[PDB]
From a paper:
Meanwhile, [name] catalyzes the ligation step during repair of DSBs through classical nonhomologous end-joining (NHEJ)7 and in V(D)J recombination that is critical for immunoglobulin gene maturation. The mammalian DNA ligases share a conserved catalytic core domain architecture comprised of three subdomains—the DNA-binding (DBD), nucleotidyltransferase (NTD), and oligonucleotide/oligosaccharide-fold (OBD) subdomains. All ligases employ a multi-step catalytic cycle, wherein an active site lysine attacks the α-phosphate moiety of either ATP or NAD+ to form a covalent enzyme-AMP intermediate (Step 1), followed by release of either pyrophosphate (for ATP-dependent ligases) or nicotinamide mononucleotide (for NAD+-dependent ligases).
In order to determine the structural mechanisms underlying [name] DNA substrate binding, we co-crystallized the [name] catalytic domain [name] (Met1-Asp620) in the presence of a nicked duplex DNA substrate containing a 5′-phosphorylated downstream primer and a catalytically incompetent 3′-dideoxycytidine-terminated upstream primer. In a crystallization condition containing 10 mM MgCl2, the enzyme binds the DNA substrate in an open conformation similar to that observed in the previously reported structure without DNA bound ([name] Met1-Lys609 with bound ATP, PDB ID code 3W5O20, henceforth referred to as the apoprotein). In this open conformation, substrate binding is mediated primarily by the DBD and NTD subdomains, and the OBD does not directly interact with the DNA. First, DBD α-helices 4–6 and α8 engaging the upstream DNA duplex (5′ to the nick) shift by 2.1–3.9 Å to interact with the substrate, while the other DBD secondary structural elements remain comparatively static. However, this helix would clash with the upstream duplex when DNA is bound. Thus, this region is displaced and becomes disordered (Lys345-Ser358) upon substrate binding. At 3.25 Å resolution, the electron density for the bound nicked DNA substrate and for the adenylate group covalently linked to the sidechain of Lys273 is clearly defined. Thus, structural repositioning of the 5′-phosphate and/or the lysyl-AMP would be required to facilitate nucleophilic attack and the adenyl-transfer to the DNA.
Residue numbers in the entry: 9 to 55, 59 to 113, 124 to 344, 360 to 473, 476 to 492, 496 to 603
Amino acid sequence: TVASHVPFADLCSTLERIQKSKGRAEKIRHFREFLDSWRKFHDALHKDVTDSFYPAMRLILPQLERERMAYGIKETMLAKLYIELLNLPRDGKDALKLLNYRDFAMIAYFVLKPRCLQKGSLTIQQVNDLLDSIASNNSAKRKDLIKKSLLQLITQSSALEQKWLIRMIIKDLKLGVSQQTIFSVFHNDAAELHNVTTDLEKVCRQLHDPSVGLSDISITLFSAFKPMLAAIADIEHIEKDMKHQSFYIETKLDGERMQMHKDGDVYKYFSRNGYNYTDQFGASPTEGSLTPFIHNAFKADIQICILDGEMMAYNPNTQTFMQLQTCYCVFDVLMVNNKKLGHETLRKRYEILSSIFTPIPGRIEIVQKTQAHTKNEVIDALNEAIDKREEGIMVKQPLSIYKPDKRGEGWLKIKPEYVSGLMDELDILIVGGYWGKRGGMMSHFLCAVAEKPPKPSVFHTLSRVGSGCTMKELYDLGLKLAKYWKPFHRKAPPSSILCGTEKPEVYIEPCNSVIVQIKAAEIVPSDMYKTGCTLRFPRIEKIRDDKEWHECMTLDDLEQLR
DNA sequence: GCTGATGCGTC
DNA sequence: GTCCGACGACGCATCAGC
DNA sequence: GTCGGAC
Ligand SMILES: *P(=O)(O)OC[C@H]1O[C@@H](n2cnc3c(N)ncnc32)[C@H](O)[C@@H]1O
């Protein structure tokens, strides 16, 4: 194998040459120099071949390391680890410079310059093996061995080789060249293949010959693909960006992005960046937080499947999602049995997705898709979504295919525009409530502002806001206020709360109530509230226990804000 | 059993 | 307009010391 | 995820 015959110092030399290079091309040139040399050596050495550039690549692009588990080490633990071995003074200057560095690599390089041995004898593979050892020992929760392995690494290397090793352990090289540049240099199809593998060794083994190339590249089973993303659409321009044809509107979830590979009783789960969570959601119907519950959800004719969706936390008590059990909400299928669905239209994918399994509420579901045409519908969807305490809405082309790691390209996400100023902090009082349509708690609150006192007494309603119970602090707030709600009588209202056209279902006297910090996009004129204005896209950012009920912002503050 | 420190991967 | 590299929040995990 | 700089 090649990695056994190549000194780590040469790699470090290349990395140094790349780092100190000013322009995009020189960097590319030095890399090319190294890579070409490596390939030549490979050709010479091997004359069945599993060997490839991977042992180098994984060091060159350590952020793409997958096979090796986490090191369990960052700058501080490394400083703590290093200071012990060299036996530096505990309180000494060097140790102090290490300890608080705020470029840890460089600072560590200058400290080890006089201390380190003349120079290192280790190859790339040895380094790989020792790093493997560290990761493994970390996974096994034994530090005593980690110390040993790292010590072996330190003893056999030059200062420069370790500044690089450190930067490989931190998994940031700071070369000044993007990974796609590296990939473009290595092979023309490298990026394309990495996007549907997220396996550096796969990429390095398959594409080894720069002249040769792959035929059909696409989603595989048990191979992590970089999920398709959504660009931010801009406001009014939407109608033109959807092709003017019919389009899907669906809800914008805050879960985590998770894709599920299934064969029979065997399962694999991958995250956004291609990390394997299978230990969590489980590899089999007998283990994990998810798979056991969803195993019988699938239809009998389903053998092999690939799904992409948003993993959510579902409260069985309240029948809602909390930003208690793990729930997998699935918006796409890239594979079913012997058929690869990746190239089929979104419509077809939804059509198939509906048929592969039966929803289990709170365990596994299908995202709701609202077919739409007109901008007004999008607007309505946004404004309605915010009262559910969503973050926005999603809009998609029914005819668009799945394009891994492509932001935009048929997927759009709409959020409201929020100012970075005080329009994101308005501390205002809950003076009212409405009941949800289940719906056994307050769905929305009615919120108000006060007038400048010589406590206050009279309040003027400002805006409604969706109170739906999606975080604990909302339910707790709900519970705390139960005893204090009173039925609102339109013919005989309370004098403490002055209301416009909009009247609540129940009120609460301000002294028993709570201040909420509400962000909003902006203040607009309204005939429905006493202030004569309301909040566009209001949401509750925080509940305030640091503020008493009398601390509510006045009409003067609001007038100042508008 | 508790708690602050430190790592890891996410949106 | 595009790429892309610093940012910060969160939840969750261990674990040393009390 | 968002931001803001270099092209
Ligand atoms: P916001 O910009 O905070 O979130 C956007 C990302 O959320 C994920 N996502 C949520 N809901 C969906 C749906 N329905 N389809 C696809 N992706 C979804 C994506 O990762 C967004 O980029």
